[PDB]
Amino acid sequence: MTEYKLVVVGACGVGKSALTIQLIQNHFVDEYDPTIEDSYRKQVVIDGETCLLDILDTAGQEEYSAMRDQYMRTGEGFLCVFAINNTKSFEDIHHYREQIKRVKDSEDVPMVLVGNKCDLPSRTVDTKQAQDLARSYGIPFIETSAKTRQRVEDAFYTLVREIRQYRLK
Ligand SMILES: *C[C@H](O)C(=O)N1CCN(c2nc(OC[C@@]34CCCN3C[C@H](F)C4)nc3c(F)c(-c4cccc5ccc(F)c(C#C)c45)ncc23)CC1
Ligand SMILES: Nc1nc2c(ncn2[C@@H]2O[C@H](COP(=O)(O)OP(=O)(O)O)[C@@H](O)[C@H]2O)c(=O)[nH]1
Ligand SMILES: [Mg+2]
């Protein structure tokens, strides 16, 4: 099958692991160990194509090294996650995109911006604000809830679609 290497990035606590485990296992994990970084695979059919998703759930220590860069560089698309009730995690998005552009050495990298925890009532980041930022980046924006599973498949499948478009260009 066709493999897609996805990398889930974003601040501590935004829901990277919860989103990943929701997609793979269809259940919601609270308080998942923030130090554990793993890759998860799933075979899925997206727009008629059988896909093997290989999803890196980034975690643990913020590390910069030639080795780490090399590893990140193998990522084909990046799910850039913030939490809609945490403004700092949203303003961190610039940094993550900066590092992605740096290691991929391109201003064109498949990316999807994800505003997670959209089930919560105490939003601090407006949907429109994130939409406008995503538009400036030229990437899709989707709000998700790893808790209710709202748009979780949409978020990951949108990233696959972005990678497919990049490959065809
Ligand atoms: C909670 C738990 O420890 C956790 O999940 N994480 C996630 C990974 N990790 C991390 N953080 C940051 O930015 C954190 C920030 C706050 C303190 C200082 N620092 C700078 C900003 F102010 C925000 N950044 C990165 C990071 F860039 C990378 C990484 C390293 C090398 C290259 C690349 C290339 C592309 C990438 F997408 C990433 C990513 C992610 C790269 N890695 C991990 C980071 C905090 C702990
Ligand atoms: N209400 C709500 N809580 C979430 C959601 N996603 C993650 N969480 C909670 O936020 C905390 C951090 O999530 P986690 O997946 O560990 O974040 P990570 O550090 O980015 O991997 C956990 O307690 C989760 O239960 C969500 O969509 N809604
Ligand atoms: Mg985690």
Side-chain angles (χ1 to χ4, degrees), residues 2-4 43-52 164:
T2 305
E3 179 174 329
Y4 295 88
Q43 187 170 306
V44 299
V45 173
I46 303 170
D47 307 335
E49 169 185 62
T50 307
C51 297
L52 177 62
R164 186 181 291 158

Side-chain angles (χ1 to χ4, degrees), residues 142-159:
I142 296 168
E143 291 187 359
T144 59
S145 171
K147 181 171 175 181
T148 70
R149 211 164 200 276
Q150 183 168 18
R151 298 192 201 93
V152 171
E153 284 192 8
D154 289 351
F156 282 95
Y157 289 8
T158 295
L159 182 55

Side-chain angles (χ1 to χ4, degrees), residues 24-30 32-60 62-168:
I24 305 298
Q25 305 180 2
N26 319 89
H27 68 99
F28 175 56
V29 172
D30 45 44
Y32 192 71
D33 192 331
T35 70
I36 295 172
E37 174 177 301
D38 276 310
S39 290
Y40 290 84
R41 291 182 168 206
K42 188 181 193 177
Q43 187 170 306
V44 299
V45 173
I46 303 170
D47 307 335
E49 169 185 62
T50 307
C51 297
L52 177 62
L53 308 187
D54 184 346
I55 303 171
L56 173 60
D57 175 31
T58 63
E62 180 185 4
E63 169 202 357
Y64 302 101
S65 71
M67 273 205 67
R68 186 61 161 168
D69 282 354
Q70 168 205 240
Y71 185 53
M72 288 283 182
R73 187 170 290 120
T74 72
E76 296 169 329
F78 294 77
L79 201 75
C80 296
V81 187
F82 69 96
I84 62 153
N85 66 333
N86 194 284
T87 300
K88 171 68 158 72
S89 71
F90 176 73
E91 296 297 350
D92 284 347
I93 290 295
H94 180 91
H95 163 78
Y96 288 101
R97 173 174 165 269
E98 170 190 87
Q99 296 308 313
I100 293 166
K101 293 165 51 183
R102 182 180 60 79
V103 301
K104 303 296 286 176
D105 199 25
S106 177
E107 313 215 314
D108 180 21
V109 184
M111 294 181 35
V112 170
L113 180 67
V114 173
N116 189 46
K117 313 201 184 181
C118 72
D119 58 283
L120 292 177
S122 181
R123 169 191 297 274
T124 60
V125 181
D126 302 327
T127 298
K128 175 86 146 48
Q129 184 171 1
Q131 287 177 334
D132 289 331
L133 185 68
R135 203 178 310 100
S136 82
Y137 292 169
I139 69 182
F141 170 61
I142 296 168
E143 291 187 359
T144 59
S145 171
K147 181 171 175 181
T148 70
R149 211 164 200 276
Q150 183 168 18
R151 298 192 201 93
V152 171
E153 284 192 8
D154 289 351
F156 282 95
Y157 289 8
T158 295
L159 182 55
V160 170
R161 285 164 173 149
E162 288 294 286
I163 295 168
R164 186 181 291 158
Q165 289 302 311
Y166 178 92
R167 288 179 177 175
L168 290 174

